[PDB]
């Protein structure tokens, strides 16, 4: 439940702080009745490194099903809006996260297609999938996506 650190091929770090990990793992689809959860990844750009400081959480505003999710709530943008204000422009939107009803997850064709069409990544972005036992995390640059590696 501490921090998680992921690295790319250039050793650019992607840091998920401990409070974010606990929030993410609280939406693990541990039961067969559990529906999909998700939101935005919000954090800090420090050179080529990224630090995930906050996330937006699911609300009843969102369409949540067992193997599908529609992040529609207006509160997601407000979290990005307010964190930008409180941080004087240092805590910014960085990507998207959602859950998968599987132990060790990987993105599907719908996940990849929606990411290339959804997140604009003129600057680096992060995608995250919360599995029942572990996390899949990837980095987006324009239209290209690549899985990160867990730092030894």
């Amino acid at each position: 439940m501490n921090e998680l650190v992921f690295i790319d091929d250039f050793d650019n770090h992607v840091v998920i702080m401990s409070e974010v990990v606990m929030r993410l793992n609280s939406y693990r689809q541990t039961h067969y009745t559990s529906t999909e959860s998700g939101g935005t990844l919000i954090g800090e750009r420090r050179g080529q490194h990224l630090v995930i400081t906050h996330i937006s959480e699911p609300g009843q505003d969102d369409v949540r099903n067992r193997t599908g999710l529609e992040r529609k709530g207006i509160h997601h943008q407000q979290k990005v809006n307010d964190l930008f204000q409180q941080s004087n422009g240092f805590i910014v939107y960085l990507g998207e996260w959602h859950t998968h009803p599987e132990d060790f997850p990987h993105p599907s064709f719908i996940d990849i297609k929606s990411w290339v069409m959804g997140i604009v990544a003129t600057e680096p972005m992060i995608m995250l999938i919360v599995g029942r036992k572990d996390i899949w995390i990837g980095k987006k640059i324009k239209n290209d996506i690549k899985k990160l590696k867990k730092k030894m």
């Binding site: 770090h13 840091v15 490194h49 599908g68 992040r71 529609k72 959804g118």
Partner: peptide, 26 residues
């Protein structure tokens, strides 16, 4: 320590809040 290299670079500021895409399906 594992995350220390990221915190050794000063953060970047952005001009305005980002406009997240409406309806993110997955």
């Amino acid at each position: 320590i594992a995350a220390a290299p990221a915190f050794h670079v000063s953060p970047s500021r952005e001009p305005e809040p980002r406009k997240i895409n409406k309806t993110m399906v997955s």
